[PDB]
Design an enzyme around this catalytic site. Sequence first.
Site, PDB file in Angstrom:
ATOM      1  N   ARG A  22     -12.898  91.052 -14.292  1.00  5.42           N
ATOM      2  CA  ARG A  22     -14.277  91.107 -14.413  1.00  5.42           C
ATOM      3  C   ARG A  22     -15.065  90.454 -13.555  1.00  5.42           C
ATOM      4  O   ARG A  22     -14.584  89.108 -13.331  1.00  5.42           O
ATOM      5  CB  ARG A  22     -14.705  90.734 -16.059  1.00  5.42           C
ATOM      6  CG  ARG A  22     -16.191  90.599 -16.091  1.00  5.42           C
ATOM      7  CD  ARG A  22     -16.563  90.207 -17.479  1.00  5.42           C
ATOM      8  NE  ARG A  22     -18.006  90.138 -17.824  1.00  5.42           N
ATOM      9  CZ  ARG A  22     -18.450  88.930 -18.291  1.00  5.42           C
ATOM     10  NH1 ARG A  22     -17.473  88.056 -18.348  1.00  5.42           N
ATOM     11  NH2 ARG A  22     -19.603  88.711 -18.309  1.00  5.42           N
ATOM     12  N   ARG A  69     -37.305  84.725 -18.218  1.00  5.23           N
ATOM     13  CA  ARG A  69     -36.970  83.275 -17.933  1.00  5.23           C
ATOM     14  C   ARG A  69     -38.294  82.354 -18.058  1.00  5.23           C
ATOM     15  O   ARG A  69     -39.394  83.184 -18.067  1.00  5.23           O
ATOM     16  CB  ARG A  69     -36.255  83.098 -16.606  1.00  5.23           C
ATOM     17  CG  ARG A  69     -34.994  84.084 -16.617  1.00  5.23           C
ATOM     18  CD  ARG A  69     -33.825  83.648 -16.014  1.00  5.23           C
ATOM     19  NE  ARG A  69     -33.339  82.283 -16.601  1.00  5.23           N
ATOM     20  CZ  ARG A  69     -32.066  82.051 -16.975  1.00  5.23           C
ATOM     21  NH1 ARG A  69     -31.148  82.823 -17.059  1.00  5.23           N
ATOM     22  NH2 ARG A  69     -31.785  81.075 -17.927  1.00  5.23           N
ATOM     23  N   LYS A 123     -23.114  97.752 -22.864  1.00  9.61           N
ATOM     24  CA  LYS A 123     -23.035  96.477 -23.687  1.00  9.61           C
ATOM     25  C   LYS A 123     -24.068  96.109 -24.742  1.00  9.61           C
ATOM     26  O   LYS A 123     -25.456  96.200 -24.355  1.00  9.61           O
ATOM     27  CB  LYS A 123     -23.039  95.053 -22.606  1.00  9.61           C
ATOM     28  CG  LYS A 123     -22.071  94.986 -21.471  1.00  9.61           C
ATOM     29  CD  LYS A 123     -22.300  93.823 -20.564  1.00  9.61           C
ATOM     30  CE  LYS A 123     -22.298  92.568 -20.691  1.00  9.61           C
ATOM     31  NZ  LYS A 123     -22.982  91.787 -19.987  1.00  9.61           N
ATOM     32  N   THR A 142     -16.483  87.369 -25.583  1.00 10.18           N
ATOM     33  CA  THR A 142     -17.042  86.304 -25.572  1.00 10.18           C
ATOM     34  C   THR A 142     -16.342  85.215 -26.599  1.00 10.18           C
ATOM     35  O   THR A 142     -16.319  85.516 -27.842  1.00 10.18           O
ATOM     36  CB  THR A 142     -18.676  86.449 -26.033  1.00 10.18           C
ATOM     37  OG1 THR A 142     -19.328  87.425 -24.824  1.00 10.18           O
ATOM     38  CG2 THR A 142     -19.371  85.183 -26.292  1.00 10.18           C
TER      39      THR A 142
HETATM   40 MG   LIG Z   1     -26.026  89.006 -21.582  1.00  6.06          MG
END
Ligand SMILES: [Mg+2]
EC number: 2.7.1.40
Lengths: 518, 518, 521
Positions: free
Chosen positions: A60, A107, A257, A315
């Site tokens: 990855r 952000r 995802k 994760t």
């Molecule tokens: Mg992410």
Amino acid sequence: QTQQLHAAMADTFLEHMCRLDIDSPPITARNTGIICTIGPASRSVETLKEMIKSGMNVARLNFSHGTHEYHAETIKNVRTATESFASDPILYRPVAVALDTKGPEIRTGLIKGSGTAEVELKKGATLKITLDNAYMEKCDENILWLDYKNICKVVEVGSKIYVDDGLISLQVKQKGADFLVTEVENGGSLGSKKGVNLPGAAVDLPAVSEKDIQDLKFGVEQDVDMVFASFIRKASDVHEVRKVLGEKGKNIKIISKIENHEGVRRFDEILEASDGIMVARGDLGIEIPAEKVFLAQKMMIGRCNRAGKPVICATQMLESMIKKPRPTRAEGSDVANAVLDGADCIMLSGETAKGDYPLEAVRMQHLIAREAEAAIYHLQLFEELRRLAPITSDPTEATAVGAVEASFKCCSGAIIVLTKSGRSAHQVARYRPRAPIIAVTRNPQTARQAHLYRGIFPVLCKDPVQEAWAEDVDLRVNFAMNVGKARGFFKKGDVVIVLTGWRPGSGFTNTMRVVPVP
Amino acid sequence: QTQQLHAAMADTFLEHMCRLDIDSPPITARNTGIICTIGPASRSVETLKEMIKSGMNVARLNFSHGTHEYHAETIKNVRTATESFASDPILYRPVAVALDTKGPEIRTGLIKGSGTAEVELKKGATLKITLDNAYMEKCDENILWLDYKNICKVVEVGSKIYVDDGLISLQVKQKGADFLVTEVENGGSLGSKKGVNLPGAAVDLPAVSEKDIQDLKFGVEQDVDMVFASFIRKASDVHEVRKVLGEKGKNIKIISKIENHEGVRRFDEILEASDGIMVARGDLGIEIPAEKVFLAQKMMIGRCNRAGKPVICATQMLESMIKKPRPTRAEGSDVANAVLDGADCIMLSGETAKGDYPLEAVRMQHLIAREAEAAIYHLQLFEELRRLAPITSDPTEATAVGAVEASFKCCSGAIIVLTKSGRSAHQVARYRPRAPIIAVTRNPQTARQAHLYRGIFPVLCKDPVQEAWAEDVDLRVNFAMNVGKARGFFKKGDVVIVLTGWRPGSGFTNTMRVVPVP
Amino acid sequence: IQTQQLHAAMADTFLEHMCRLDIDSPPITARNTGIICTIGPASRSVETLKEMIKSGMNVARLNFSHGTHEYHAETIKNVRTATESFASDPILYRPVAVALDTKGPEIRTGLIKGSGTAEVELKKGATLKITLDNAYMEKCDENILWLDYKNICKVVEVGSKIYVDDGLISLQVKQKGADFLVTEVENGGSLGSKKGVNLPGAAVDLPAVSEKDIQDLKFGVEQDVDMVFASFIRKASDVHEVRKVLGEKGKNIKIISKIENHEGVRRFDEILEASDGIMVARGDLGIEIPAEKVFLAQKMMIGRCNRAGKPVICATQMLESMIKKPRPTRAEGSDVANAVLDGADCIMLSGETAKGDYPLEAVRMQHLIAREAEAAIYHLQLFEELRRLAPITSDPTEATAVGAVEASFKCCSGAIIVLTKSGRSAHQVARYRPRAPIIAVTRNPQTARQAHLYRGIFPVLCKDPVQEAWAEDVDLRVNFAMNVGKARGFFKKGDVVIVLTGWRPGSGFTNTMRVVPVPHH
Ligand SMILES: [Mg+2]
Ligand SMILES: O=P(O)(O)OC[C@H]1O[C@](O)(COP(=O)(O)O)[C@@H](O)[C@@H]1O
Ligand SMILES: O=P(O)(O)OC[C@H]1O[C@](O)(COP(=O)(O)O)[C@@H](O)[C@@H]1O
Ligand SMILES: O=P(O)(O)OC[C@H]1O[C@](O)(COP(=O)(O)O)[C@@H](O)[C@@H]1O
Ligand SMILES: [Mg+2]
Ligand SMILES: [Mg+2]
Ligand SMILES: [Mg+2]
């Protein structure tokens, strides 16, 4: 007794559990693919050889950070490490390469001066949000800036706003055209350029960032095997990514995802448009209550199993091995359960990219996956899949089920499938046999992409095509027989299942044979 | 919708029942074999052609009565009728011949004077049973003689005694060493040389009678395909019959007839030693309470299904059609339930041998069996058989299950098996596919014996082998393709399963292909 | 060595269940399937009816096909005489219900030229004209045949079959006028007079109740029958008709719809919804639809009746041979077992009890088989399946019933005892099909009689006055059932039993389940 067989016989799920046996050692094959994120701690050729050896199947690449030249080098190295073993085609294990996009983000701006300074947020205080650019550079505890110009359109009075990886928590008390007035629920230290999630919101950021468009085009150029597309929310998103890889990259597996509520709510439409799914537990458990994540994981692996599309489990699976050479009991347990849940991949992030123990993490994932694979309740799992299998008069599907049933009947040491595109092997895997599927392909991309499917062991025939198509078929069968033998999946005498076709070219697989190993 | 498919989909047995549909027509194939007893009403060539056409698959010969010359002629005729259709091998149905032994018996003596006279038994009267030979010739309504020297040892005060095929019914009121004093429960006409059953008592008569020894030798000579061995009680018995057929007849299938308590009690040992089983409900329901028979039938069909050995379902199934051209609702029901119970054969006795309506009986059995075959709950039946299937590393078995699974997956029009011995076809049948099994064999005995197994349609290739073994295989496949087409089991386009081997000779069947019909 | 087919009830698969049925595993003494006997020449005597009750009769069927009011009135008088002969001891008294089975609408032919005894011969392939013109009523030959169904033409197409004399003769319509039909003989045979006609696949528009029916039903109201078997129910409006006819004065009489043709099967759903129960009328049915298809319809119907918790009856020819012989054929034995295994509430006898040589032998035979088959059920799955298809409801009575039935499975309970006024509570227990007998204790005699219509309810009629304290009155009725159970040999001191009561008097408060050991009282 071995391979948890006594437990596989049990009539009830409960008896099945009751009969799991720590003295029942697994078979040697391991079916769950292992995805390692490559980074500082694992980029070296010399290290990557050790990763492959330990059981890495995919590399990855995390476009969160690092430039094109940096990633291009990671890929060059992965490749170098891989082809180092190409000199003996029996033992050569393909390694796939995967480009994981940064995706759109929200952000904040910089705290008063240096991006190094912080401010202190008190539970209950007021915190004004502007989008006015004047404030980009000077963010204090009274005014905070965002780069999501359209936040106002997508939030109601009462919505939560999560700042710095859901550490800080704000609630909208008033909404103008230009500003928001929030109250701090969760206090803490506010820093610079920190990331924002809008829990519950239908966030309208484009499917791909401008960076993403370019990062993706690079993946096409670099010839990656799959892309993990970040922050897929709707199916139009998946369609965007497909359009972007476009023709030259029409064979690259797009893996959506799922990172927020909209993603979960719309999973169905998404799954339809995707080649596969990644259950992105990190981001996901910032967007939805953490206690709810296992629900989403189980829903997703479930529906992916039903649809016969690859599912990834990501994760923090072995998080503690960033700092320690052995995992926590919960981590051990997490990995077993993802396997039992019926996940295709398992993944490592920090653990391989930055951690002190990349190899220990890979080997640990290898060890657990094997044990858990034996511990599946195939009796029910098979019964269930078969009962939910659509009626089709497609020979390929009929052959696969036949094959998988046959393999259960004879404790087959492997199901050997000749596949050009991988399709035939996928169809076998979607039924989840206990036995490994050795897929024999001359197509290298097929070899690499196959890792994405529980139990397929891709094996790459580098011989030239033989005159008679018959003998060429026999040759490839024989190759797999040798691979199986050498890797210790079976010995002379044991029985195996072989799937062939009746004519050359894709989707003619329709011949199932039960063969004793020479 | 057709073939009770909507009902086959149901998740529960209950919903399955709820969904059986009188407007959902069966396919044309009929899987349950039909055994007709040949006798006065059906022995003529001209009639037998009509029987075959109507659906007879086996001819039963009842050695209870009739001489060697008589039976030899029945066989000659059955054969004549059969080969009458041999000129077109596509349409020719093999017909088997079965020798049903008289077996050991308990007989009474002659009524006072001529064995043509009768006496009346009155409900409630006393009826003395002697073994004293004085009475052999002169049996009245006060004293009745038997040829079973050992009756007194095996019966207590209170035991029932059945005289003349359980027409007359006595209960023992006092028991000496030499005599019995009984009371008549069921009145009736007492005749000469009438047969006696001692219900519940374990009759120790030798396994095979003197007549049996000779009758069996005849069956060897006449080249029968199977024997229904009467009054099998223990496994020793089966071993006797096998020994007697001995070498010259080692290929004749022995089918043990369970006719009394000891037979049921010891069914396991028996089944193990037998090629098959007949549930002989007539005799049986004289020996055990009639209300208990369906228990025994269900137990036996059950365990035969488990063991993958043929079970027969006999006696009185369409009884009323001895006198009438249509059956009773209970008879219709009886036949359906035998099929649903999972019986291989169904049988006709009186109805074909002596009755006014032999053809109507056969056609009726044909009609019901078809309807009931569609009405089976294959979902569960298959699940159950699979779960109770031994794990085996025999390729042939693994191929069969795979084939049957495949056939369920694709609503296959047929499973085509090339078989020399029949074994491969049996192994497919033992898993009970909905689809007909066309077995292609060059061996005529195999062809005939195949009828004993649910769903096998034997088809006899009479051509020589020619040229390459491959093309000979293809030829036989193609033969079955034509048979299937012509008999209306499937059309061009439909998908079918074909089972072949990798090498000539028995065993080695291990290749399953899923082929569209040309 | 075990009893009541317990080893087989344990089996994990249906197949293992079958494989483990055991002829040496004797049943319990209770028998759950109700038995309906048609009363007629061979069984009308009081002296005989006592013997029927003793043997296991639970309902008396009266077939209004034949026999007059005066005749039937006498049959009923006798049934009652026989029943109350045992009323002297309420512990042993078995209620018996009475059932009026209507003749229903028919299609009849006319008389053959001259004597109604003379016949004509019909040849496979010949033409056969059908008139409705009344001129021909008296003179029917082999060329022209008359019917009393004035509306036949509207309900048949070119190509339809017509079945004459109980589907013995078979015609196919070749041309259709306004007034006539031109048919071809498919099945030859001897054509007689006043023979019955079935129109297979037609939607026959004859009224739901005949003029005779209206009157026969009013009689049943007057005579106070407990249930009616309404013939030839085709659509739900039919069932509504019958209800309207019994009307107010008879609003408590259970209407049981008889399914005897295609339209009936096609529309079974709407029908079942409007009916109290169903009879699978296999005889008529297997004239209307191919005989080989009847088991399909039987199994579909008992199935859906089980799902709906409504009583299903299984009728016609179950022990037919016992009209002439004292023992049945293996197929008859098998038929009865399978009806029970199929999950039928009642089994029925027609000829066998009404006109046969052996009425008692037929009843005892049905009793014997039902008991054996009841043990042979796969309760494990049957219960699992019913529970899984049970709607979630917040009704306490339902919750109590399932609880009761589960508890009975847990403890091999000797019986589930339910105090019921309307029968409803007992029905709700039965709908879950426990292995244990349900003793329903009721002061309402009609409830007692009507209860027989449901698998496993043993109605028991408390004739005592209500006791002062409602508690002790409840206890009294519990105790009654305890005594009945004891005496009938369903359980002894020690055994454990389930008792269902309510929290307050009056119907639909049943919500208390207790597990009680049988006392020394
Ligand atoms: Mg992410
Ligand atoms: O895996 P896919 O794409 O369905 O293709 C499988 C194909 O592979 C084969 O088994 C052999 O491949 P080749 O066409 O390279 O000979 C074919 O017979 C079959 O149709
Ligand atoms: O020798 P033959 O007649 O070519 O037989 C070939 C076929 O028969 C088989 O022997 C069938 O096996 P069985 O005779 O044991 O049923 C296979 O090997 C093959 O499919
Ligand atoms: O004292 P009562 O009125 O006869 O009722 C006794 C108990 O049985 C029930 O009536 C149940 O009867 P139903 O089946 O008619 O509802 C309860 O409601 C009550 O507690
Ligand atoms: Mg005998
Ligand atoms: Mg088991
Ligand atoms: Mg009628």
